[PDB]
């Protein structure tokens, strides 16, 4: 679970960095293409992913401070981060196609 926790922290950190980077790419698309509803949908999704990542970070913090972390909480965190990785990959593609 130590290895598990350490790995989830690195995954979370990489998702935060990728998601922040996509905010600058989206803003550049907004300057280039104007205020389309398509870009509005991508901004909303980027914001939601950042919100979810912030919430998960609080749960990771609690588990790190726990002297015997619940394996179920760890597994649930692992699943949620896996979902956000896919969602962030799909957004990376969509911004690259615009």
Residue numbers in the entry: -2 to 95
Relevant lines from the article:
Here we describe the combination of rational and computational design to deliver three-helix bundle (3HB) peptide assemblies and single-chain proteins with control over topology and thermal stability. First, we garner sequence-to-structure relationships from antiparallel 3HBs in the Protein Data Bank. This gives core-packing rules, including layers of hydrogen-bonded polar residues, which are combined with surface-charge patterning to design complementary sequences for acidic (A), basic (B), and neutral (N) helices. Next, AlphaFold2 models for both designs are used to seed computational designs of single-chain proteins where the helices are connected by loop building. Synthetic genes for these express in E. coli to yield soluble, monomeric, and thermally stable proteins.
Based on pLDDT and RMSD, two BĀN and one BĀN′ single-chain designs were chosen to test experimentally. We solved X-ray crystal structures at 2.10 Å, 2.15 Å and 2.20 Å resolution for the two BĀN- and one BĀN′-based designs, respectively. All confirmed the three-helix bundles with up-down-up topologies for the B-Ā-N/N′ helices. All had consolidated hydrophobic cores with knobs-into-holes packing between the core Leu residues confirmed by Socket2. In addition, water-mediated hydrogen-bonded layer of Thr (A) – Asn (B) – Thr (N/N′) was present in a clockwise design. To alter thermal stability in our designs without compromising the 3HB fold and topology, we sought to destabilise sc-apCC3-CW1 systematically by modifying its consolidated, largely Leu-based hydrophobic core. For this section, this parent design with a single polar layer of Asn@a, Thr@d, and Thr@d (N-T-T) in the B, A, and N helices is referred to as sc-apCC3-CW-1NTT. In our case, the core packing of the parent design consists of eight layers, with three residues in each layer. All but one of these layers comprise solely leucine residues. The remaining layer is a hydrogen-bonded constellation of one asparagine and two threonine side chains.
